[PDB]
């Protein structure tokens, strides 16, 4: 259809909505669009960046001399975070420059000015140079979450790692200093890493991260056991206390059809339910619920197979099942042989498909959720570029009331869902190097 749209010069990774402007994180570019019609206002060129042995990140290398180039590299945006607390500012983190972050500050009376004030977040670490706190993001795959606690900003990161010694962390928390120059790991318990032994053998994909019920939750796809080839979905959950990661416990998230096991999480979304769904699942109108789109695996692989499910987990039931003691210590942190021990739960938490096998012949690669009266609706994307909206209800699946090819490229899991006054608003949906505005109610 004729829906508001913008095609980019380069593929789009991340997106954030702030002060009536859409900010696209794309290869070598941050684009700034108009909320109304997706009209391009301003663009920032982030790459391609020259990697040189004599250059250090966030120092003005122009000034050195006639620099004979090392490698030119494409600056893929790995993360895009809005801070409102220290400044009115946008923090972007690139694949290039050691996974360093840069922050764009907004002039008071001009929202769209990403080029005016741009500070680079890096401070030379001399005592222990191998330990870089300002090196945030992995070019393989990275998930950034930005909490505000006790008038100080924390960054919970989840980096995918294969062996490249030089020095990032699998799961970590770092505090952005009040001077805003750099980050700092407070304790040695502020991070958890995969052992040098299993960096390549045991890879971890960080699907989604979110704060809820005074906890931090990370969703992840990894091997079921260090030895085993069969792949797995897990819900990591740790406490935020003492400026460290405490009470860290991975446990398996399962989605079954009735056993067909949809064992790989493709995308996820945390939201409130509609009165109809709330009643059905034993939940309340204010309760956070993790909506998660799963997929069946090719055997001995993490690759999906064009067979999707979708199942809901109210975090309050996730936490209850978590507080139930059976157990092993975390296989990948130690060797194989809220309050000090890093844990791996044996038994999977499982849930019945909420569509009851309605999508067994398609690959779902995206999910949003919004509420219309008593009904909960879900904005599904697909690998074929097929969008669709469908009512959610455990008691009887339903034909998608909207459904059409938005593009040929897969629908990205990176999504926005805004509300205008009157409860009706829109969804922003990415397909390759194209973003489109779709309304919620038809």
């Amino acid at each position, epitope marked *: 259809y004729q829906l508001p749209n913008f095609t980019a010069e380069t593929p789009i990774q991340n997106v954030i909505l702030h002060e009536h402007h859409i900010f696209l994180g794309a290869t070598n570019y941050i684009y700034v669009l108009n909320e109304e019609d997706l009209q391009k206002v301003a663009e920032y060129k982030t790459g391609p960046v020259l990697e040189h042995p004599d250059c250090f990140p*966030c*120092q003005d290398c122009s000034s050195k001399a006639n620099l004979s180039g090392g490698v030119w590299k494409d600056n893929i945006n790995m993360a895009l975070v809005v801070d409102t607390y220290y400044d009115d500012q946008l923090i972007s983190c690139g694949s290039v420059n050691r996974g360093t972050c840069q922050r764009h500050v907004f002039p008071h009376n001009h929202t769209a000015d990403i080029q005016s004030e741009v500070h680079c977040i890096f*401070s030379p*670490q*001399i005592e222990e140079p191998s330990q870089c706190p300002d090196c945030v993001v992995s070019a393989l795959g990275a998930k950034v979450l930005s909490s505000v606690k006790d008038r100080f900003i924390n960054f919970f990161v989840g980096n995918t790692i294969n062996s490249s010694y030089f020095p990032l962390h699998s799961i970590s928390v770092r505090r952005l200093k009040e001077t805003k*120059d750099g980050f700092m790991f407070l304790t040695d318990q502020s991070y958890i890493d995969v052992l040098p032994e299993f960096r390549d053998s045991y890879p971890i994909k960080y699907v989604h991260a979110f704060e809820s019920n005074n906890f931090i939750y990370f969703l992840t796809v990894q091997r079921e056991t260090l030895d085993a080839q069969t792949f797995h979905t897990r819900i990591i959950r740790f406490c935020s206390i003492n400026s460290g990661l405490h009470s860290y416990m991975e446990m398996p998230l399962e989605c079954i059809l009735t056993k067909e096991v949809f064992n790989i999480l493709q995308a996820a979304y945390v939201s409130k339910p509609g009165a109809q769904l709330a009643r059905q699942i034993g939940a309340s109108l204010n309760d956070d619920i993790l909506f998660g789109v799963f997929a069946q695996s090719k055997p001995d692989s993490a690759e999906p197979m064009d067979r999707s499910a979708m199942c809901a987990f109210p975090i309050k039931y996730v936490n209850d099942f978590f507080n139930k003691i059976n157990v092993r210590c975390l296989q990948h942190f130690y060797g194989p042989n809220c309050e000090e021990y890093r844990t791996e739960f044996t038994t999977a938490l499982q849930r019945v498909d909420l569509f009851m096998g309605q999508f067994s012949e398609v690959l779902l690669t995206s999910i949003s959720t919004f509420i219309k009266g008593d009904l909960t609706i879900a904005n599904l994307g697909t690998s074929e570029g097929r969008f669709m909206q469908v009512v959610v209800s455990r008691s009887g699946p339903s034909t998608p009331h909207v459904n059409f090819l938005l593009d040929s490229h897969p629908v990205s899991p990176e999504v926005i869902v805004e509300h205008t006054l009157n409860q009706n608003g829109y969804t922003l949906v990415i397909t390759g190097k194209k973003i489109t505005k779709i309304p919620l109610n038809g």
Partner: antibody
Amino acid sequence: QLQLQESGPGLVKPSETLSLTCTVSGGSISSSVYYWSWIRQPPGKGLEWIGVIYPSGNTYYSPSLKSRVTISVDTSKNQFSLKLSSVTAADTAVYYCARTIYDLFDIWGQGTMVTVSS
Amino acid sequence: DIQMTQSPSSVSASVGDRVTITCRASQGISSWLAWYQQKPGKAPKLLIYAASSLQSGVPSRFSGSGSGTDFTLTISSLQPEDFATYYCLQANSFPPTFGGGTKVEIKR
């Protein structure tokens, strides 16, 4: 903790070229992490930077001096050296060799007095 | 090329005092700053790097802060050994540039 010690002529004529050498001990000159640079201090004045050599082997010099300065490394003698040329009364200063990590100086030699005089 | 203006150039303060030195830059250094202490006829000794990271061997009574253009170094409780000339160095952009210097004397 490695140590640095400068060496070379106390006295050098005007127009002649100056040669110094900083000899490293308790650590290799060849490292991926730390690298070498020269700094001087004119008598009763502030510090002023001369040049660096990175582990790449690339050399950068202060624009004040670029025409005359040459810094080099000798992996076999665990040494690096400075050759300043067309030397003038203005170059009379204490020459400090310096270990360098992320373009900041962490370890320093005692320094050598070099006096330019006929 | 990047002017580093230090102040004051001289200072005198009693043992126990909190003496405080300021470095000001002509450009955005961000964090690429170190603070050096030079005893007379000696090599400069690194105290602070990255504007506010205290060096390994250094007394806690030293500390600095700042970002962008304006940085300061504070000796919280002055000592007779803390007699020296103090320097700020910039390394955000070449050539690296040192400040004028601050001489610190003890009152007695």
